[PDB]
From a paper:
Mammalian target of rapamycin complex 1 (mTORC1) serves as a central regulator of cell growth and proliferation by integrating signals from growth factors, nutrients, energy status, and cellular stress. A small GTPase, called Ras homolog enriched in brain (Rheb), is a positive regulator of mTORC1. Like other small GTPases, the function of Rheb is dictated by its guanine nucleotide binding states: it is active in the GTP-bound form and inactive in the GDP-bound form.
In contrast, the dominantly inactive D60K mutant cannot activate mTORC1 in the presence of either GppNHp or GDP. To investigate the molecular basis for the incapability of the D60K mutant to activate mTORC1, we determined the crystal structure of D60KGDP at 2.6 Å resolution. Surprisingly, there is a GDP bound at the active site of the D60K mutant with clearly defined electron density, even though no GDP was added in the protein purification and crystallization processes, which is in disagreement with the previous functional data showing that the D60K mutant assumes a nucleotide-free form. Nevertheless, consistent with the previous functional data, there is no Mg2+ bound at the active site (Tabancay et al., 2003). Intriguingly, attempts to co-crystallize the D60K mutant with GppNHp failed to yield any crystals. In addition, distinct from all known WT and mutant Rheb structures, in the D60KGDP structure, a portion of switch I (residues 35 and 36) is disordered.
Author numbering: 4 to 34, 37 to 170
């Protein structure tokens, strides 16, 4: 089995913890906001993976980008909320500072718009975030931390993008 380490980046309250618990624990529960690493076995294309999932502390436009992430990470999930215009604007900034940090080592990157279950609360269309991912040449998905199958699909997509390198 292979070992891979995945950093989950994003603004606060966009659902980094909830997506990662929905994937690791199989369930949607609460009870962090402080960085935490989760382990998880998964098979992608018949290949077994040991995953260290780093759910980061949550970054704003000003919070410095930590180098530690760059040093050992194999893929980055950038999550925003489809109910928060601020988190979408923040993920653009996060992306530039992460490219500023690894330089241009063509590292697996993926954009996720979370909370797609909140139909009445949506302010960002699917197409708006899909255009953003394509201008980055990154994979795009909309997820809901209430729906296990969209959580699982985010995490096996970032490993798919990692095998391609
Ligand atoms: N309805 C809905 N609520 C969510 C979703 N993801 C997170 N939440 C809620 O939004 C808040 C987000 O908190 P959290 O998951 O810790 O986000 P984090 O700060 O980025 O780690 C919590 O109250 C969650 O219950 C989702 O997909 N759908």
């Amino acid at each position: 089995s292979k070992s891979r380490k995945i950093a989950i980046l994003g603004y606060r309250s966009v659902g980094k913890s909830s997506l990662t618990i929905q994937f690791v624990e199989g369930q949607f529960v609460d009870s962090p906001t402080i960085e935490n690493t989760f382990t998880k076995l998964i098979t992608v294309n018949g290949q077994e993976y040991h995953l260290q999932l780093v759910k980061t502390a949550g970054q704003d436009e000003y919070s410095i980008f930590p180098q530690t992430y760059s040093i050992d990470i194999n893929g980055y999930i950038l999550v925003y909320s489809v109910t928060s215009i601020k988190s979408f604007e923040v993920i653009k900034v996060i992306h530039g500072k992460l490219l500023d940090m690894v330089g241009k080592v063509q590292i697996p990157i993926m954009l996720v718009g979370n909370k797609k279950d909140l139909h009445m609360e949506r302010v960002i269309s699917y197409e708006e975030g899909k255009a953003l991912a394509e201008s980055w040449n990154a994979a795009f998905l909309e997820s809901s931390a209430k729906e296990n199958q969209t959580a699982v699909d985010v995490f096996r997509r970032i490993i798919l993008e990692a095998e391609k390198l």
